[PDB]
Design an enzyme around this catalytic site. Structure first.
Site, mmCIF file in Angstrom:
data_model
loop_
_atom_site.group_PDB
_atom_site.id
_atom_site.type_symbol
_atom_site.label_atom_id
_atom_site.label_comp_id
_atom_site.label_asym_id
_atom_site.label_seq_id
_atom_site.Cartn_x
_atom_site.Cartn_y
_atom_site.Cartn_z
ATOM 1 N N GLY A 268 -10.143 11.616 4.851
ATOM 2 C CA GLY A 268 -9.058 12.906 4.827
ATOM 3 C C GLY A 268 -7.595 12.787 5.604
ATOM 4 N N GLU B 197 0.978 -1.323 0.121
ATOM 5 C CA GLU B 197 0.032 -0.183 -0.025
ATOM 6 C C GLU B 197 0.937 1.259 -0.069
ATOM 7 O OE1 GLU B 197 -2.827 -0.178 -0.873
ATOM 8 O OE2 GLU B 197 -3.543 1.849 -0.822
#
Length: 182
Positions: A146, A72
């Site tokens: 976010g 990732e």
């Protein structure tokens, strides 16, 4: 407020940019020269916006472990006219657990955000959005949309970048010194 936030602030003020892709705005950690990292789910292409300036991507590599499992982390080399301060000496060499970590975010939505997330577990395997992922760090803070790309630090070490959560826990991909040898 204390030496944890002091180290976090020092990293944010010199080694972060705001990265925008077609998948949103991310905190992006600059590591050395024109090389930065971002979560692989940002889907970096040939062009990226860096602090709202159109920037050519010279190289991008989605890292996988030697089991061919997702990590990732995407390493990006930016066609930028300026180098990052070299912070590779603050990267851990090995997989580890940590005490007293801070997650730091800087976007349009969340400027100058610092979260004391506490104890960090070497969690290892996570099914992240349906994708088997290795080298995951976990912390018991209800992180939100976010915060992806947020930098996880301890006093003296930059240990990971925030890649997801489940509403109660947050997850970071490890940063290791070995990813950034040249």
């Amino acid at each position: 407020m204390g030496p944890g936030f002091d180290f976090a602030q020092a990293i944010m003020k010199k080694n972060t940019v705001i990265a925008r892709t077609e998948k949103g705005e991310f905190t992006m950690l600059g590591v050395y020269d024109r090389v930065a990292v971002i979560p692989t789910h940002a889907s970096v292409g040939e062009i990226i916006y860096i602090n709202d300036v159109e920037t050519r991507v010279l190289d991008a590599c989605a890292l996988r472990d030697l089991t061919d499992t997702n990590l990732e982390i995407t390493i990006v080399k930016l066609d930028r006219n300026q180098k990052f301060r070299d912070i590779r000496h603050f990267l851990p060499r090995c997989e580890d657990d940590y005490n007293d970590a801070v997650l730091s975010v800087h976007t349009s939505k969340f400027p100058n955000m610092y979260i004391p997330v506490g104890q960090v577990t070497n969690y290892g395997f996570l099914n992240l959005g349906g994708t088997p992922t290795h080298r995951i760090l976990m912390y018991n803070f209800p992180t939100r949309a976010g915060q992806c790309g947020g930098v996880v630090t301890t006093t003296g070490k930059v240990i990971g970048i925030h890649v997801g959560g489940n509403g109660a826990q947050g997850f970071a991909a490890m940063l290791l010194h070995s990813y950034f040898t040249d």
